[PDB]
Design a protein around this ligand. Structure first.
Ligand SMILES: Cc1ncc(C(=O)O)s1
Length: 167
């Protein structure tokens, strides 16, 4: 049994809700929240922008030190950093950004990072300002992630379309 409430169970391991990821993280304090990161961990907008704002920029400060030591992530890659006031840990995952021309086949590689964590609160990778089709992102998620994932959908309209169209 876990703390997650109000989620629509899609498969054995994937759940979905219309929820504010910051507000959901603040309520649950999950072991892992996933950030929709870029390779530079520059948390300017979308999921990263919102999560980082909710940490009062502490996520960005920590991320800048990570990059100064390690250099950029790979598209499809990830790193584990603090969850600050939102979670124990933040898994920063880089999905391909279609608005930069990145290979959408890297979306599966991005989701494979979730399998290193037994339970996660996450957004749909490469959705929103990363430019991918969120229906496609949900399909790759269900077909890739084997651990228990609780997906927070930012839009009520999009949430209803994802559920209604789910095979
Ligand atoms: C505050 C948020 N902005 C974008 C989200 C998303 O595309 O998942 S959540």
């Amino acid at each position: 049994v876990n703390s997650f409430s109000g989620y629509l169970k899609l498969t054995d391991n994937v759940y979905i809700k219309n929820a504010d990821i910051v507000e959901e993280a603040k309520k649950v304090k999950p072991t892992v929240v996933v950030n929709a990161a870029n390779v530079y961990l520059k948390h300017g907008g979308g999921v990263a922008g919102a999560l980082n704002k909710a940490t009062n920029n502490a996520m960005q400060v920590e991320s800048d030190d990570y990059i100064a030591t390690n250099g950029p992530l790979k598209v499809g890659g990830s790193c584990v950093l603090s969850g600050h006031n939102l979670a124990k840990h933040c898994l920063h995952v880089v999905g391909p950004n279609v608005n930069k021309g990145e290979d959408i086949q890297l979306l599966k590689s991005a989701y494979e990072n979730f399998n290193q964590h037994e339970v996660l609160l996450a957004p749909l990778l490469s959705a929103g300002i990363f430019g991918a089709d969120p229906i496609h992102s949900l399909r790759v998620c269900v077909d890739t992630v084997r651990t228990n994932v609780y997906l927070a959908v930012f839009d009520k309209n999009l949430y209803d379309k994802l559920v209604s169209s789910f095979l």
